[PDB]
Amino acid sequence: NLKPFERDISTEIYQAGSKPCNGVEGFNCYFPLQSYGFQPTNGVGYQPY
């Protein structure tokens, strides 16, 4: 977890298991940023604030 008012621009691949991920993709490792699917048909609470 980040500290108070820390910012993090990092885009390097996250590892989610015991085995290494010395590369761009895998089963137990991921790109760390995910997009919000902000469609107007989303209910409130799923809309952008």
Add this chain to the structure above:
Amino acid sequence: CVADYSVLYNSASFSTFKCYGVSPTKLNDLCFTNVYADSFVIRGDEVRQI
């Protein structure tokens, strides 16, 4: 019984492994009163419906 989910999850044989109440790393130390394993065969197209 004692459940070694770290042996289970870090295996390569699973084409899908997905958890919904927890991130899977909690299972190594989190405790429960009982556990049920519900086990069956389906088309690979339909694993998403589970």
